[PDB]
Amino acid sequence: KSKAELQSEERKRIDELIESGKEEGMKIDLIDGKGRGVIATKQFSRGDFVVEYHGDLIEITDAKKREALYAQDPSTGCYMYYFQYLSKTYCVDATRETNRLGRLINHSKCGNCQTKLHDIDGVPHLILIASRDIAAGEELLYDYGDRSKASIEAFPWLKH
Amino acid sequence: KSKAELQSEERKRIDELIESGKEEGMKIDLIDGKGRGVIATKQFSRGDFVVEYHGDLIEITDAKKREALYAQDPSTGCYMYYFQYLSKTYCVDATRETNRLGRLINHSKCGNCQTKLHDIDGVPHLILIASRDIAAGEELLYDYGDRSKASIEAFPWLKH
Amino acid sequence: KTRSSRAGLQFPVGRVHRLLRKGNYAERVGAGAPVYLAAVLEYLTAEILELAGNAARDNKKTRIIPRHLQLAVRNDEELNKLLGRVTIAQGGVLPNIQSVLLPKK
Amino acid sequence: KTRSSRAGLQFPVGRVHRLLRKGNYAERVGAGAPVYLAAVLEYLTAEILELAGNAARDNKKTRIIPRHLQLAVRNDEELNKLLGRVTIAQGGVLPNIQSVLLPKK
Amino acid sequence: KPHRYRPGTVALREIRRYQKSTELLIRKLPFQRLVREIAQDFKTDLRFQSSAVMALQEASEAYLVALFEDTNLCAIHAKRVTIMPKDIQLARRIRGERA
Amino acid sequence: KPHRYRPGTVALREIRRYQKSTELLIRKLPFQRLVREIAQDFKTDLRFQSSAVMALQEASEAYLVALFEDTNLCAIHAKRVTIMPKDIQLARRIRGERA
Amino acid sequence: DNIQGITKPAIRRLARRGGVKRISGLIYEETRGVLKVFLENVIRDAVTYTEHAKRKTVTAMDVVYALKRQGRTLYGFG
Amino acid sequence: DNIQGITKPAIRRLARRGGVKRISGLIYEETRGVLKVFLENVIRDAVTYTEHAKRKTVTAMDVVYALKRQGRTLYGFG
Amino acid sequence: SNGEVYAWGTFRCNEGILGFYQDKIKIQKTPWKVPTFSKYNIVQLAPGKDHILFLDEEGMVFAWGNGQQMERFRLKTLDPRPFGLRHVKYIASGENHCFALTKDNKLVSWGLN
Amino acid sequence: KTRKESYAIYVYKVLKQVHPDTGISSKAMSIMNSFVNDVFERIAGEASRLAHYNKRSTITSREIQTAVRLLLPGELAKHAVSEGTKAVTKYTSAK
Amino acid sequence: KTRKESYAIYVYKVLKQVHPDTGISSKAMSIMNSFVNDVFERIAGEASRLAHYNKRSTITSREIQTAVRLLLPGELAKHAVSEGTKAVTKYTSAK
DNA sequence: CAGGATGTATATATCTGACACGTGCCTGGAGACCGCGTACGTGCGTTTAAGCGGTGCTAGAGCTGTCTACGA
DNA sequence: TCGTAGACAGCTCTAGCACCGCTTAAACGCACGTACGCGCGTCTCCAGGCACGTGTCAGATATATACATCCTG
DNA sequence: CAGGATGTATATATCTGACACGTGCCTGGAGACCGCGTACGTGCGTTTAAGCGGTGCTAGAGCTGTCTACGA
DNA sequence: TCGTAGACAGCTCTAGCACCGCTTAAACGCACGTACGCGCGTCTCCAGGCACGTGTCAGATATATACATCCTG
């Protein structure tokens, strides 16, 4: 198959996974010093679609607003994910507690999952794809991105 | 004075009367076989502004709608006044009972008041101007316009 | 020898060399200028035609209607521009209805 | 004798008769064609200028800025069209704010 | 309860129908009036080719087709399904016909 | 309670202020980057007059001034005071830049 | 009447031609003012174009060439 | 970066220049895509106009004459 | 003497019509003061024609009415104002002929010759 | 140094008649040349084409004004249409 | 009866090559002449001006294509740009 | 949850006229130099006039030959 | 000066204008109600091109199927 | 219901440079042929880099003279 | 055929590019909260025009007033 045929087959598999909302081969577990963490129940190959970073979609401050009220109450964890979806800050605020698993994935700079923008007829979709072969039992992790001095001062685990 | 200077002075007097909402030289009286009628308490000269046909302004069916509900209840009298305000049916529905006097003026084809469109910076205003010298005590009347066969069949006073 | 015979495009590229001169586009106008233009014109005439030809077959039987012709030009994103400041007569709209217009239940 | 002297408009109507010929507007171009055009051009140059002249005095002291010049052309409803497909540089907007934008209490 | 179609379906088809035809949708004899009318304010005592006549309709007929089209967004984009007065105007400014 | 201006008055003046100046409101050195950037996709290894350079800003700077202007109605006409994403787009169609 | 000429089942017709889902009350004769407007803008330059060649019978191509200059060059006749 | 170049206190600046009462969150970089777009449309025909006379240094009048053809003839330089 | 300048009447134009203060007044029968035109107090006057031509304290040859014989159309000129000259001491107007003289001993005259 | 035949002088001169003091800018004193540019241009082509769509191989005043009317906006047109008329009558009445 | 030199024949001929059966309408077979009209026209002026803003008193292919590229839309341009190239090479290779 | 009343997609006989190709002709081209509430939709009855053609009258566009004033 | 486009009286004939009764499609009017708005260069040779005439197949037409689609008891 | 903190309209000293007018020059022009809730505004602290100029290097636009192939 | 525009090697020098430390304006980040989004033709003569040079007044500049305007206890 060509490069275009493989990309179309990879896009059709990603579109079906985003539509069904299936989060198979993944279960919640209590990580030591991280609250909730996502761990693999089956072997995920390199390049395989893991799970969508699902939540409430909106504009730039259209996610950074519940920020200024979620700072007013520290208990609700930081679950906002900003992104540049075609020149405009388009995000997915997963602050509300749901059964979706993408919002519970922990941080690691050298983890086993990369965050990418997956467009489906105009509507942006944050997806988590396996950067390498993820072993069964191991924790699913991805680079959170916020390497700023204010954020790293409050929780030092963002650095590593 | 020129024709333009007299029109500007006539427009400035009409704009002040529409703004203040003054209905001086006019009082309500029970006319024989017409419900309520408007009668003059002072002598009104030919061309003098009598009173604005005041009510709720709106679009074409934007007045002919409370029509289809006011037919569902016959007691509320027909008080809608349609008009072509610059290519678009713009009216003034005076169905609601208020202290304004223009909605209580009776019908007559050869009366003593003519209905005209008076624009004030884009907003249309139906005004009643004296067609002739109105005598004190006499009833203020104006041509209602609806000479149609369906309307004239239900109330025969529209003809005369 | 016909120059259009020589160069090999149908739409008379002697009328192009002769429309040009007395059309008052400029003072002088080289032989090829009509030619390359002629072929600019016909690669259009042709690229156009067949869009109808395929479309007109599709809807109608054989012969192109006007609202066939423009039923093509709307649809080719490239031409859609080219003929985006024009008004091809008897066309009517290549239909569309908004998503918030069709049924809902 | 200068033709502009003769006809009585300032902007050289020999340069109009000579811009026209080698401008390639057409084959031939009568004497008056430059003239009436020259005077078309200057009744514009002038009608334009003074709008600035009155405006530039108003805001500034003596000399017209660009944003003076276009501060005029926006405001003359007639020109406002004429220069309605143009973009006079350094202009900026003859200001306006919507009725639902200013204060409210 | 005789046979009926719920409010919208009919005119939705009106779209299907009117969006199908190449049929100039406003009466000829009527326009020739409007055509000859605006003549007067231009040049009193004139004639025009019946051919030409059509075009004038054609264009302004067409012009209107898209300016009503463009107008559809004007209320589509205002939390509206039904196209009122302002909606028509708004479009004029984004064209710059007026503003 | 130190000194403060209620939300809106400030940027309302921003209008007063920015609506006053003939001052190209986006940094030169920055655009020369964007200027030279879109060069590459056109013609690799090129030069341009600093003069010319300005215009390119000028126009698109200006273009934007009115397309943000026109854009103001797009949300003014949507029961809105604050101009969001769609609002920007809507205007593009009424221009016919896209649609 | 002339402006009454552009009558409801035609504005509408013309408006369903762009998928107009529903015409409002005022909206209708607004089209007449517009169609007036458009008529107005056009016939004028066109007649003016008939003038600059002295025709008492206005040409179709005059309509057209003027229909071009305005900015919506129509195709077909010309 | 280039598109990052058109930075917030400038989009805004440019937007307050038409009385923009408030820029929304997404709206900002949309301007970058647009200003990209507009940049794109233009520089291209312009360079193409430099090409048809073989200049490696692009003229201002090339920018202009192309800035004309596009449809927004700018005045001043030219 | 205070500085402000009174007014009355209405000038007859070159075409031949009525104007007082541009388009805000046509016939000024009632005598009224004229507003601020040049900060320096206006010294003398200069009558003749419909062409009134004051002189400021600084020596700024001001000018109202037509002065047709600088140049314009569609009114908006009657109510102003300057300009020309440098520091004229005598402003001496006839009907369709003007006269001026700069404090630097100059002799000028700009009108319908 | 190739001679740049700019309307600068002429653009300046017509300023004086309308307004004596002063007064321009460099950026604007180019802006003027691009008001003279777009007009001289736009005018010539509704002049040029006129000749073609009225079959005469020479641009007379016949066209130039017809365009001028057809090209200028409403009240302005009649004005410059008048000012032409004038410069038309004076051009004919010379020695 | 003055001879109306219409693209009718030529417009018809190029139909055959693309599609043999059939096939046109009267209204459309005018519409074609006004696709040939606007192009022949629009093309000539980005050709004409090109010559003026590159100072050469004769419209070569040099311009005609440069416009053609500058005037046609993206993929179409390269196509007809190719078809010219072709009709350019064949015109040169004749007897 | 579903079968019956609307009216649209579809099929095929059949006459009509415009598409299409032959021909004498003549000139231009060739070649050499969420909720209260009302506004507008849907459908049927009354009624206005658009569309139809039949056609006589002639305005006026279009073409030609001649004289001559315009502009390169 | 002088080649010649433009003025212009003169003339063929297309085509625009007014006419005018009539089948009927369509504009108009109106009652019921529910989805929806709204507030909360030049002389010469000659064949390519066009006006003209003529036969018929593409398509408009219409009776007539079958079909997809919308909606209340 | 109102006086005090922001920052805009306004006034005037003062240096700077571009507007403006003089001049030798040369070519083109003339002449004769309602309410839940969050997104974005306002304001102050931290921090990136735009703007500044000082300037050497030389790409390449611009102009010229010559030979000759292009197109009327 | 042949007048000549265009090709083109050759050459003056404007002007675009890279450099590069530094005062600081401005972009950036963030906390608090309230208004606001959102759901409910040609030869000849010559002076008009332009490139060049030069002096200074219009205007940019800045310290410094006074002023209109917005907002909480």
UniProtKB/Swiss-Prot annotation, chains A, B:
Post-translational modifications reported in the UniProt record = Ubiquitinated and degraded by the DCX(DTL) complex.
Q: Which residues cross the membrane?
A: none
The entry's family comment says: Belongs to the class V-like SAM-binding methyltransferase superfamily. Histone-lysine methyltransferase family. PR/SET subfamily.
Effect of altering residue 107 to A?
Answer: Strongly decreases methyltransferase activity
Cell compartments where the protein resides: Nucleus; Chromosome
Instruction: Determine the domain of life of the protein's source.
Output: Eukaryota
Q: What function is annotated for this protein?
A: Protein-lysine N-methyltransferase that monomethylates both histones and non-histone proteins. Specifically monomethylates 'Lys-20' of histone H4 (H4K20me1). H4K20me1 is enriched during mitosis and represents a specific tag for epigenetic transcriptional repression. Mainly functions in euchromatin regions, thereby playing a central role in the silencing of euchromatic genes. Required for cell proliferation, probably by contributing to the maintenance of proper higher-order structure of DNA during mitosis. Involved in chromosome condensation and proper cytokinesis.
Q: What is this protein called?
A: N-lysine methyltransferase KMT5A
Residues covered by the SET domain: 24-145
Q: Where is S-adenosyl-L-methionine annotated to bind? A: 34-36, 79, 106-107
Q: What is the effect of changing residue 67 to A?
A: Strongly reduces affinity for histone H4
Q: Induction of this protein: by what?
A: By HCFC1 C-terminal chain, independently of HCFC1 N-terminal chain. Transiently induced by TGF-beta and during the cell cycle.
> What happens upon changing residue 78 to A?
Strongly reduces affinity for histone H4
> Per UniProt, what is the name of the gene that codes for the protein in this document?
KMT5A
Assembly, in brief, is:
Interacts with L3MBTL1.
Curated annotation (Swiss-Prot), chains E, F:
Location, primary (coarse class): nucleus
Q: Which of the residues bear the PTM Phosphoserine?
A: 21, 50
On this chain, the residues bearing N6-(2-hydroxyisobutyryl)lysine are 20, 28, 43, 86
Q: Which domain of life is it from?
A: Eukaryota
Annotated GO CC locations: nucleoplasm; nucleosome
Processing and modification events after translation: Acetylation is generally linked to gene activation. Acetylation at Lys-86 (H3K122ac) by EP300/p300 plays a central role in chromatin structure: localizes at the surface of the histone octamer and stimulates transcription, possibly by promoting nucleosome instability. H3R2me2a is present at the 3' of genes regardless of their transcription state and is enriched on inactive promoters, while it is absent on active promoters.
Statement: the UniProt record of this protein carries the keyword Ubl conjugation: yes
Where is the protein found, in the record's own terms?
Nucleus; Chromosome
Keyword annotations for this protein, in alphabetical order, are: Acetylation, ADP-ribosylation, Chromosome, Citrullination, DNA-binding, Hydroxylation, Lipoprotein, Methylation, Nucleosome core, Nucleus, Palmitate, Phosphoprotein, Ubl conjugation
The modified positions for Phosphothreonine read 44, 71
Q: Which GO terms describe its molecular function?
A: DNA binding; protein heterodimerization activity; structural constituent of chromatin
Q: Where in the sequence is N6-methyllysine found? A: 1, 20, 28, 43, 86
Q: What family does the database annotate?
A: Belongs to the histone H3 family.
Put simply, this protein is called: Histone H3.2
What is the species of this protein?
Xenopus laevis
Which region of the full protein is contained in this chain?
38 to 136 of 136
Curated annotation (Swiss-Prot), chain I:
Q: What induces it?
A: By pheromone.
| Localization annotation | Nucleus
Question: Which parts of the chain are RCC1 repeats?
Answer: 2-57, 58-103
Q: How is it modified after translation?
A: Phosphorylated; possibly by KSP1.
Question: Whom does it interact with, and what assembly results?
Answer: Component of a multicomponent complex composed of six to seven proteins, which has a collective molecular mass greater than 150 kDa. Interacts with GSP1 and YRB2.
**Stated role:** Guanine nucleotide exchange factor that promotes the exchange of GSP1/GSP2-bound GDP by GTP and controls RNA metabolism and transport. Involved in yeast pheromone response pathway and in mRNA metabolism. Involved in nuclear pore complex (NPC) assembly and required for mRNA and ribosome nuclear export. Binds chromatin and is involved NPC-mediated transcriptional control.
Q: What is this protein called?
A: Guanine nucleotide exchange factor SRM1
Q: What is the lineage of its organism?
A: Eukaryota, Fungi, Dikarya, Ascomycota, Saccharomycotina
- Please state the gene responsible for encoding this protein: SRM1
Instruction: Report where the shown chain sits in the full-length sequence: first residue, last residue, total length.
Output: 182 to 301 of 482
Swiss-Prot record, chains J, K:
Q: Which UniProt keywords apply?
A: Acetylation, Chromosome, DNA-binding, Glycoprotein, Isopeptide bond, Nucleosome core, Nucleus, Phosphoprotein, Ubl conjugation
**Residues bearing glycans:** 82
Localization, UniProt: Nucleus; Chromosome
Show the cross-link location (Glycyl lysine isopeptide (Lys-Gly) (interchain with G-Cter in ubiquitin)): 90
Query: Is tRNA processing set as a keyword in this record?
Result: no
Q: How is it modified after translation?
A: Monoubiquitination of Lys-90 by BRE1 gives a specific tag for epigenetic transcriptional activation and is also prerequisite for histone H3 'Lys-4' and 'Lys-79' methylation.
What main location does UniProt list? nucleus
A cellular component term, taken from the record's GO annotations: nucleus
What GO terms are given for molecular function? DNA binding; protein heterodimerization activity; structural constituent of chromatin
Q: What does this protein do?
A: Core component of nucleosome. Nucleosomes wrap and compact DNA into chromatin, limiting DNA accessibility to the cellular machineries which require DNA as a template. Histones thereby play a central role in transcription regulation, DNA repair, DNA replication and chromosomal stability. DNA accessibility is regulated via a complex set of post-translational modifications of histones, also called histone code, and nucleosome remodeling.
What is annotated about its quaternary structure and interactions?
The nucleosome is a histone octamer containing two molecules each of H2A, H2B, H3 and H4 assembled in one H3-H4 heterotetramer and two H2A-H2B heterodimers. The octamer wraps approximately 147 bp of DNA.
Describe the family membership recorded for this protein in Swiss-Prot or TrEMBL. Answer: Belongs to the histone H2B family.
Protein name according to UniProt: Histone H2B 1.1
Provide the species name. Xenopus laevis (African clawed frog)
Its lineage reads: Eukaryota, Metazoa, Chordata, Craniata, Vertebrata
